[PDB]
Design a binder for this molecule. Structure first.
Ligand SMILES: CC[C@H]1CCCN(C[C@H]2Cc3cc(O)cc(O)c3C(=O)O2)C1
Ligand SMILES: CC[C@H]1CCCN(C[C@H]2Cc3cc(O)cc(O)c3C(=O)O2)C1
Ligand SMILES: N[C@@H](CCCC[NH3+])C(=O)O
Ligand SMILES: N[C@@H](CCCC[NH3+])C(=O)O
Lengths: 482, 484
C-alpha cells in the first residue's frame, strides 16, 4: 500500500543518518548491459573471467532468495536484462558486511556494480559483484511484468519498465521517423521549420492562444501546408518538415489534439510522381522494419483474429465520385453544391442511414458518402482514393482532363487516412479564396512552379506498423484529464 | 508600378483565351541547375554538346536586349545560376515564331527549357534552347539585388530569391540541426516526442502561452521546456534520450528573443556536470570545424558597419563561477542564505551603485541573474565561457554541489554575452526537491528512482545566429513572428 513507500522513504533517511549517500553523484560505467552481453555471450558454462573487472549499472527487477552466501538479482538496462550473482567468496568485505549490503536492496533500485563477467554453472550469463552501491532507490513498489489498465498513459515510465512491448513500440516509432527523414534527405530534400502561431489557420477548429507582448490572438497551426508552398516560390524546390500540428477537435481512439505530421513539396513533379513516391516509401518502409511487405494487424483486438496487410506496390486507385455513383447507383450532377445534388446526396445519407454531417455541405456530404461506401471497402492492402472534386480540394490544382475534379490522392490503411497529396494549384486567378493567409495568396502571384506536395500522418502510420488499435499507444504522453 | 501586375494578369487571361495554358501541369525535367553546372562546368570555351538534349527548369532572373536573333537570359535554380543563350537559328520554328515565344518571357518567370549544354565563346556556361515553355508566370515586378528592409521577413520567398546570403544562412541552420541530430544519434541517444501542451509550466523561468481545449474543457499551457517529461523518460529506462522542437515563452520580442524558438535537450544517465562540460566543448568545436574548417570565426557583434570580434572555439573553454566573480568584481561578500534580507540588501545596493536595470520582481535569483548579466556575461567575447556553480536558489531542478554548500553543479555557456546553453547534473533525490514535499506526476516519477543523470539544453536559434554572422533573431527564423 502506501505503507511500503513510508518504509522505503525512512530507509533513505537511515542511510543519510548513517553517513551514506543513497543518491551519489557519479558512478563511472565502463560497459552497458547490452554491451556486456555481446562481449561475453559466448562464454562457457561456469567460466569466470575473475581478472577483468567491469563497472556496470542498471535497475533491479528481481531479488531472489537470501541465502547467506549466494545472492541472485536481475539487472535490467537499455531494454535488456542480465543476472547478478553476489557470492560471499567474491565479495569485498572491506567496504561493508555482505549480508548488510544486500538485504537493503529492494526490487526497483538503481544500483552500481563493480564485478567481473562470467556464466553460471546452470548456463545464465551473470555479472559477479565484488562491490554493490545504491545509486537511486525506488521508494514505491514496481508492478509485476504483467500488471499493466490505463496507468500506461499517465505513468509511462512504469509502462516502459514493465511491459517489453512498450519499448519496442517506441523504438520502431522513431525508426519510422528516422527512415522518413533519410528517405527525403537521400532524395535531395531540405528540412526546415515553419511557425506554429499565425493569424489564420490553413477542415479544423483552431487552438486560440494570446501573445502578451503583441496583444493579438494567434491560431495554433493545423497544417504546415501554406508556408512550405511559400518556400517553393522562394527557390527551395525540395522542402519538407516533420513537426506537431494541432486540431481542436474530438479525442478518441484515432484522434489526438496534437499529432505528428510530415509534409514535403516537390517542384516540377505532379500527381503521378506522388503515387510512385508513396508506393516506393511504404513498401521500403515496411521492408526496412520487417524484411517483408506483408504485415499482421489486429483490427478487432489481440483476443480476436488479425488481418493481413500486403504492402507490395502498386496499390489500387479508386475515384471517389465514380464509386459513390456506383455503390449507391446514383448520378450526381455538377456542380455538386447545387440545391438538387445536395438534396440527392442527403437522400442517400438517409436511405443508407448515415450520420448526416453538420452543416450539410456538398464537401461534407461527399466526404461522408465516401467514408461509408469507399473507405472501409479494402483493408487487406493499402489503396488510394483519387480525383476529389475541387469543392473538397481548395488548394489542389484542377484536374487536367475531367472537369470539376482535381489531381488529389488519399492513401488508406484499414479504412483510416494516413496520407494526403495532390498537384499543387499554382494559378492565383483560379484560387477564388484569394479573391487563407493573404501572404500566401500574394506569394502565388510571384509565380509558384508546378509542384506536388504530400502529407503524412506519422501517428496513424506507426499505429498500423506496431499492431496498435489506439493512438494513445504510439504517443509517449497523450493529453488527458487529471 | 502595379500596372506591371495588371498587364501581367491581363496577359495571363488572354493567353488562356488563345488556347494556351500559362500554368501547365507537368514538365519532365531531366537535370537540375546545380547538376547542370557540376556536369558541364569543365568545358571548352565555345564547345557545344550538340547531341545531348536536356530538359531543364528554373526561374528567369535577367532578360537582356530584345534582338531578334540572340536572346540572353539568367536562369537560376537551387541557389545557382546558368545563362540561357536562345539563338534564332537553333529554335524549332514548328512550335512557334522565335520572337513571339520569347517576348512573353519576363524576369521572374518559371520556364522549362529543352536544349543542349555548352559555353559561349566568351566563357560563360550556358544552355542553348530549341524551345522554351512558360511553367508559372511571375505577375509582380521583382526587386533588384539587395533591394530589401523588413519586407524580407514578411515575404521570405523574396529574400531567398534575391540575396544569396540568406539561402546560405538557412542551409547552415538545417546543417547545424542535422549535425546535432547525428551527433547524438552516433552516441546511442534516442530521439522522442514529448507533448507540447501540458497543464503546468516547468523547466525554466518564463511566462507560458495559454490555450483552451474545447472537448476537454481545460486550459493548457504551451511548454516552456521539455525538461520534465524527458527526465521521466530517463526513469522509464531510456538512458540516452533527447528531443528537438519548438518551445514557447510569452515574453518580449527583440534582437535575441522570439515568442517561439527551437530547443534541444538531451539527458544522459550516469553522467554529471563534468561529462557535460566535455560534451559541450567537443560538440561546439567539432560543429564549427565541420562547417568552416577552422575553430576561429568572426562575428559582427554590433552591426556590419562596426568592428567585429573573433570567437575562438578551440577547446577547452574558460570556467567562471557566478558567485565567485560577482564577489570579486564588486569587492563584496555575499554569503548564504542568498535570499536573506542582508544579502538581498547588499545585492540591491550594487544595483543602484552601478545604475543597473533592476529585475522585476527583485527576487534573490533574479537579482543574481541580473548581476551576472551585468558583471560576468559581457566579459569574454573572444571565446565561449561557462558560468559554473550556480546557487540552489536559481536551480530548483539541479542537484546540490558535491563539495560546495548552497550551490548546484550547473553550467551555462555564453557566446558574446548571450546564453546558448544550460546544463547541470539532475536532482535525483525527491526528498531534496523542495516543491515535491512543477507537476505531481514529475514528483512521483522521481520517487520510482531517477538514476544519476546529466541534462543539457541548447538554443538552436541563438547558435545559428553566431554561426551565420547574424545580429537579430528574425534573420535565422524563416517566418519570424511579427504584427501588421
Ligand atoms: C497532416 C497529415 C494528414 C494527412 C491525412 C491524414 N491526417 C490524419 C490526422 C487527422 C486527425 C484529425 C484530428 O482532429 C486529430 C488527429 O489526431 C488526427 C490524426 O491523428 O490524424 C494526417
Ligand atoms: C533552449 C532552452 C534555453 C537554453 C539556454 C539558452 N536559452 C536562450 C533562449 C532564451 C529565450 C527566451 C525567450 O523568451 C524567447 C526566446 O526566443 C529565447 C531564445 O531564443 O533563447 C534557451
Ligand atoms: N495539409 C494536408 C496535407 C498536405 C497536402 C498537400 N499540400 C493535410 O492536412 O492533409
Ligand atoms: N530545460 C532547461 C535546460 C536543460 C537543463 C538541464 N536539464 C532550460 O529550460 O533551460
Amino acid at each position: 500500500p502506501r505503507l511500503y513507500f513510508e518504509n522505503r522513504s525512512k530507509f533513505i533517511q537511515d542511510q543519510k543518518d548513517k553517513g551514506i549517500n543513497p543518491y551519489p553523484h557519479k558512478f563511472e560505467r565502463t560497459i552497458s548491459i547490452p554491451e556486456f552481453i555481446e562481449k561475453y555471450k559466448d562464454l562457457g558454462n561456469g567460466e569466470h573471467l575473475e581478472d577483468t573487472i567491469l563497472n556496470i549499472t542498471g535497475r533491479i527487477m528481481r531479488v531472489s532468495a537470501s541465502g547467506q552466501k549466494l545472492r541472485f538479482f536481475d539487472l535490467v538496462g537499455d531494454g535488456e536484462k542480465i543476472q547478478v550473482l553476489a557470492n560471499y567468496s567474491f565479495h569485498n568485505h572491506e567496504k561493508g558486511n555482505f549480508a548488510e549490503c544486500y538485504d537493503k536492496i529492494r526490487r526497483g533500485d538503481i544500483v552500481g556494480i563493480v564485478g567481473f563477467p562470467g556464466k553460471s554453472k546452470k548456463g545464465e550469463l551473470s555479472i559477479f559483484p565484488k562491490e554493490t552501491i545504491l545509486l537511486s532507490a525506488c521508494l514505491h513498489m514496481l508492478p509485476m511484468k504483467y500488471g499493466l489498465t490505463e496507468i500506461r498513459y499517465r505513468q509511462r515510465y512504469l509502462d516502459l519498465l514493465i511491459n517489453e512491448s512498450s519499448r519496442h513500440t517506441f523504438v520502431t516509432r522513431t525508426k519510422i521517423i528516422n527512415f522518413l527523414r533519410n528517405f527525403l534527405n537521400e532524395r535531395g530534400f531540405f528540412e526546415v521549420e515553419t511557425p506554429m502561431m499565425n493569424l489564420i489557420a490553413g477542415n479544423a477548429r483552431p487552438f486560440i492562444t494570446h501573445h502578451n507582448d503583441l496583444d493579438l490572438d494567434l491560431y495554433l497551426r493545423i497544417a504546415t501546408e501554406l508556408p512550405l508552398k511559400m518556400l517553393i516560390v522562394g527557390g527551395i524546390d525540395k522542402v519538407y518538415e516533420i513537426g506537431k500540428v494541432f486540431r481542436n477537435e474530438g479525442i478518441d481512439n484515432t484522434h489526438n489534439p496534437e499529432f505528428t505530421s510530415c509534409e514535403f513539396y516537390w517542384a516540377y513533379a505532379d500527381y503521378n510522381d506522388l503515387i510512385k513516391w508513396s508506393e516506393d516509401f511504404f513498401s521500403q518502409l515496411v521492408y526496412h522494419l520487417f524484411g517483408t511487405y506483408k504485415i499482421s494487424y489486429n483490427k478487432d483486438g489481440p483476443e480476436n483474429q488479425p488481418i493481413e496487410i500486403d504492402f507490395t506496390p502498386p496499390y489500387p486507385k479508386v475515384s471517389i465520385v465514380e464509386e459513390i455513383e456506383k455503390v449507391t447507383n446514383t448520378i450526381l450532377e455538377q456542380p455538386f453544391d447545387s440545391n438538387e445534388t445536395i438534396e440527392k446526396m442527403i437522400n442517400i445519407i438517409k436511405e443508407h442511414k448515415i450520420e448526416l454531417p453538420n452543416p450539410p455541405t456538398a464537401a461534407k456530404l461527399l466526404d461522408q458518402l465516401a467514408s461509408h461506401f469507399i473507405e472501409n471497402k479494402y483493408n487487406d492492402k493499402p489503396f488510394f482514393i483519387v480525383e476529389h472534386p475541387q469543392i473538397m480540394s481548395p488548394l489542389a490544382k484542377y484536374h487536367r482532363t475531367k472537369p470539376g475534379l482535381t489531381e488529389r490522392l488519399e492513401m488508406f490503411i484499414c479504412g483510416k487516412e494516413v496520407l494526403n497529396a495532390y498537384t499543387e494549384l499554382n494559378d492565383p486567378f483560379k484560387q477564388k479564396e484569394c479573391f487563407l493567409d493573404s501572404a500566401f495568396c500574394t506569394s502565388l502571384e510571384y509565380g509558384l512552379p508546378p509542384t506536388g506536395g504530400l502529407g503524412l500522418g506519422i501517428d496513424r502510420i506507426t499505429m498500423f506498423l506496431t499492431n496498435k488499435n489506439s493512438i494513445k499507444d504510439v504517443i509517449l504522453f497523450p493529453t488527458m484529464r487529471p
